[PDB]
Design a binder for these strands. Structure first.
Ligand SMILES: [Zn+2]
Lengths: 135, 123, 141, 149, 214, 55, 99
RNA sequence: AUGCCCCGAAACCCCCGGGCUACACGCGCGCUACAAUGGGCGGGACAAUGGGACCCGACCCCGAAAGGGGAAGGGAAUCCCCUAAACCCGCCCUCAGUUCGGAUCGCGGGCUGCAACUCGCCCGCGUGAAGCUGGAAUCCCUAGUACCCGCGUGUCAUCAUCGCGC
């Protein structure tokens, strides 16, 4: 059967998604997406499928494995991987244009990463500094 | 005013008791110290105390062992404990059992503050 | 059943609109944990409202408080796990508790220990630093 | 259905309710007077927290098996209020976890793998999966999207 | 507490939070119309990505802007209702999930109380709380002079949203009322032009000061 | 006149159990990889030891 | 089979040794696994610049990087004889294991 | 490292004890809080940087906790520290110096160390002080930055409200 693999990266989270013909079952780390918590993360994961449509959602199966990051970085990585898998599977340039217009980050990764800390209260952050006394 | 008793035992019973039972009766710190054993200086001090109790030692007892734990067999004797400069006399009493010998030889003088100096405040 | 607005258990007036757990905490020497332990030993519901307690339940609480160790409460949950004189495991509440604490402090002062000196002077007793904190008096100079 | 198909908390509470019928699962004699970790401040407010903890430990053994006492302790630990000191993470106690695992083994739900920890027996796997199937069957009406799973 | 069908809500259409649509929401202020984004959006969370670009906030949904404004402490260097609101360890700072839940509950309360679209009520509140004139100092010659100036739509929207958030914080500060209820009450009062609303009171004060200065 | 005195007691721990191999200082000794060097001496011998300043 | 662990300070000497092993295996006629680059070990030490305490605190981050490669070569008389005949430069440490 | 001056049987070397930890007060940097944008209880999730030989120690058993006994593997992409918290769900509390706050004390149990009273750290029970948002004044920050939340390492036999990093 036709099986397509895609990858998504957000912060320190990496998601590998496998897409094949199925009955609309989308699982993240072996768990159904419908019982994903919190609601914000569930919506983040489910947005690309809703954009793609009910028929494409129901006529395909997606399995996503995400490692690293937090509960929001993992959701973003899974969303990007699912979007890329859907575009590659459908081969629909109109769908690709719709995804690009709605949110460019779904198809194009997020380069933003943590800035390394620097002295003068390094544990607080790169730019946070100790309070000045002056007297 | 009542007869002294430590964990339900009198002074005679404490004297007849061995080291292990005394360690059991003592708190955790003293029990651990007794289980680990006495230092050679503490052993020398204990030998001097035993000789004084037997009566073949009449000179005053002085020591630098501020970490020695008071035992019931040391009750009734005056021990001069070093406090940094002098050998402060301490008369051991039954209620003093289980306390460190250095708790009764203060090393710092009481502070009686005087007038603040020129640099004490922002003036 | 009969609901009493104010219930007196061990010389202390317990509230009627509060759960038994926090109601029992009004007695000096009884915290939330010990109150829960006493309720569980007595078989009373910790979450029931105080005031529904009957006389028999009150007496059961009194006898449990009188002898906690003998009633199943562990020996490591009492106020005095090893009494200085008797050597038994005792739990003291209110006047007995203040008397015991005062007696311990007085014994330290009588034997002239360092802790006794610190208690007499009112300065911190557990080896804290007094240069920048523990300032009770007013500004001088 | 499978444990992966249902929310964790609902399955844990249902398994805890079911476990009350097993004679082997019995709270210890010191259960009413203990805390569930040094980082905790007050005693549990359930009066039956032993069954909930046993069910949680059983689900953890099912999922992450083989697992051991120390790993379960660091799972069940948490943040502590240290007064004026900043908050810090601490591990949980070991007696509760050890007693729960021994009781589960006596009931026949888990077994020891030497040098590796404790794994779930087929009986325990079936015990979890039947309850998960019942929970999913109940949830299907409320959430029709779970029917396809 | 919450129903299971609500705890596991599964949307199927592109609409705000999966419950409310902005198709019928109307903005009658020409100044603020181009800067209130009401495009079809399901999740109001762009993870920033708009601070870099100048005038980048014009493409951010109004609900997300409200969530970001709510995600704060309330007061650090200024006083709202005559008090500081310095919440350090118990603030919503950097808690977008909590802000999202608060905003959702406030929208539900607004819908139940009014019977209209909560986004429409929010638009009305913003329109009625956006000031039109301010005062500022201009240095001509060798000294300064206080003169009245107009306010750009960007600053109008920013001030309206900040004032609404501050009023909600003040109403929810150290009272039995919750944050969501306070936000809903503030939005309803601002929409209804009631003077008790902090945003409307601040708008009136600013406009009066500007009129006096001019 | 005894040689038993003027000698240092062995110490398995504490600040006096470690000295810089170049100085003998008892202060900031670096024992990250058995270097046993002062924080001052490391600043001087890092290029010789091969350490560089990539960051 | 034989396992070769080569660790050095400079990637150029590491690559020279690896290329020597690759050429020796190519001429030798054995089945050799490619050079596996293990994660580089970066020893980092942060030290205060000033010898005294006066002035703003400044720090420098000295770093030492150690690169590691792994090679698997099927056992053979002349093969691993020539392998033990490797030049083994000074800055490279080589370990041979038989499994 | 080094010039001059000085001590040179002392200002040089070693050891026991004490002090650097005192305390009417003034000040700088922080931690904890003055609560519902919460406190407690049970349950459900998601990291990274680094370190490990008189060392990290899985796993088993004994304990209510601290902790104690045995012991696999690991000179390390192989084994361990290591199933973080903020976050989510259910219940109690409903604006109160309180189920907020956790200083200050009493009793008891442990760890390290030759030694824990001056002068260490940890746990159980008990008591429960100011504090209900802060004048003049003043500090940091422009994108994964600020805020909030934890973790690793340097010091280390034991001790982190600290520095450097994640
Ligand atoms: Zn040196």
């Amino acid at each position: 059967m036709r099986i397509i693999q895609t990858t998504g990266k957000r912060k320190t989270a990496i998601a590998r998604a496998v897409i094949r013909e199925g009955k609309g079952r989308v699982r993240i780390n072996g768990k159904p997406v419908e019982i994903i918590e919190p609601e914000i993360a569930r919506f983040t994961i489910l947005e690309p499928l809703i954009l793609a449509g009910e028929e494409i959602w129901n006529s395909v199966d997606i399995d996503v494995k995400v490692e690293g990051g937090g509960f929001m970085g993992q959701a973003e990585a899974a969303r990007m991987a699912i979007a890329r898998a859907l575009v590659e599977w459908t081969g629909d340039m109109s769908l690709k244009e719709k995804f690009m217009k709605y949110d460019r980050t779904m198809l194009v990764g997020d380069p933003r990463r943590t800035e390394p800390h620097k002295p003068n209260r390094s544990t607080k952050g790169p730019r946070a500094k100790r309070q000045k006394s002056y007297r | 005013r009542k007869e002294f008793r430590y964990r339900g035992y009198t002074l005679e019973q404490l004297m007849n008791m061995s080291l292990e039972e005394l360690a059991r009766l003592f708190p955790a710190r003293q029990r651990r110290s007794l289980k680990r054993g006495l230092t050679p200086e503490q052993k020398k001090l204990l030998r001097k105390i035993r000789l004084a109790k037997k009566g073949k030692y009449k000179k005053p007892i002085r020591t630098h062992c501020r970490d020695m734990i008071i035992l019931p067999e040391m009750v009734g004797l005056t021990i001069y404990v070093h406090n940094g400069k002098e050998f402060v006399p301490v008369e051991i009493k039954p209620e003093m059992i289980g306390h460190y010998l250095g708790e009764f030889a203060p090393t710092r003088k009481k502070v009686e503050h005087g007038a603040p100096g020129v640099g004490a405040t922002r003036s | 059943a009969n609901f009493r607005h104010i219930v007196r258990v061990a010389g202390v007036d317990l509230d009627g609109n509060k759960q038994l757990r926090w109601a029992l905490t009004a007695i000096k020497g009884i915290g939330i944990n010990f109150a829960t332990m006493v309720c569980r030993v007595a078989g009373l519901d910790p979450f029931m409202k105080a005031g529904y307690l009957t006389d028999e339940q009150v007496k059961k609480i009194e006898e449990i408080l009188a002898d906690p160790v003998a009633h199943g409460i562990p020996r490591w949950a009492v106020n005095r796990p090893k009494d200085y004189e008797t050597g038994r495991d005792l739990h003291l509440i209110t006047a007995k508790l203040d008397m015991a604490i005062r007696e311990d402090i007085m014994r330290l002062r009588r034997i002239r220990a360092y802790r006794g000196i610190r208690h007499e002077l009112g300065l911190p007793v557990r080896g804290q630093r007094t240069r920048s904190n523990f300032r009770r008096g007013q500004t001088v100079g | 259905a499978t444990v992966y198909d249902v929310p964790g908390d609902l399955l844990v509470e249902r398994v805890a309710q079911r476990l009350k019928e097993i004679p082997e699962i019995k709270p210890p004699e010191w259960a009413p007077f203990v805390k569930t970790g040094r980082h905790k401040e007050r005693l549990p407010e359930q009066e039956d927290w032993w069954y909930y903890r046993v069910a949680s430990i059983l689900r953890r053994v099912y999922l992450d098996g083989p697992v051991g006492i120390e790993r379960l302790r660091t799972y069940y630990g948490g943040r502590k209020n240290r007064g004026h000191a900043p908050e810090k993470f601490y591990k949980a106690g070991g007696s509760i976890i050890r007693k729960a695992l021994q009781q589960l083994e006596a009931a026949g739900f888990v077994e020891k793998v030497p040098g590796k920890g404790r794994v779930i027996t087929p009986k325990g796997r079936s015990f979890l999966d039947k309850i998960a199937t019942e929970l999913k069957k109940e949830l299907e009406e409320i959430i029709p999207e779970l029917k396809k799973y | 507490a919450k129903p299971l069908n609500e705890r596991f809500f599964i949307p199927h259409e592109i609409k705000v939070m999966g419950r409310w649509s902005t198709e019928d929401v109307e903005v009658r202020d020409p100044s603020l119309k181009p800067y209130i984004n009401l495009e079809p959006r399901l999740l109001p969370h762009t993870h920033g990505r708009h601070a870099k670009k100048h005038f980048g906030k014009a493409n951010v949904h109004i609900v997300e802007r409200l969530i970001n404004k709510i995600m704060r402490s309330g007061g650090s260097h200024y006083k709202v209702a005559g008090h500081f609101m310095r919440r350090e360890h118990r603030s919503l700072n950097s808690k977008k999930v909590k802000a999202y839940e608060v905003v959702k509950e406030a929208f539900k309360i607004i819908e139940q109380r009014t019977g209209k679209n909560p986004i429409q009520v929010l638009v009305w509140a913003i329109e009625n709380a956006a000031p039109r004139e301010d005062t500022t100092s201009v240095m001509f010659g060798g000294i300064r002079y206080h003169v009245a100036v107009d306010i750009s739509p960007m600053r109008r929207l920013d001030v309206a949203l900040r004032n609404i958030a501050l009023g909600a914080s003040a109403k929810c500060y150290r009272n039995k009322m919750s944050f969501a209820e306070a936000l809903a009450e503030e939005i309803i009062l601002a929409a209804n032009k009631d003077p008790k609303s902090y945003a409307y009171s601040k708008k009136l004060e600013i406009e009066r000061i500007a009129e006096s200065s001019r | 006149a005894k040689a038993d005195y003027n000698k240092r007691k062995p110490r398995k721990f504490g600040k006096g159990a470690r000295r810089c191999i170049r100085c003998g200082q008892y202060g900031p000794i670096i024992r990250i990889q058995g270097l046993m060097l002062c924080r001052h001496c490391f600043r001087e011998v890092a290029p010789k030891l091969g350490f560089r300043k990539y960051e | 089979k034989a396992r070769i662990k080569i660790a050095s300070t400079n990637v150029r000497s590491l690559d020279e040794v690896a290329n020597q092993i690759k050429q020796i295996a190519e001429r030798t006629g054995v089945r050799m696994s490619g050079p596996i680059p293990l994660p580089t070990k970066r020893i980092r030490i942060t030290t205060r610049k000033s010898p005294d305490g006066e002035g703003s605190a400044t720090f420098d981050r000295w770093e030492l990087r150690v690169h590691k490669r792994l090679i698997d070569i099927e056992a053979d008389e002349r093969a691993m004889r020539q392998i033990m005949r490797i030049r083994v430069p000074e800055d490279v440490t080589i370990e041979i294991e038989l499994i």
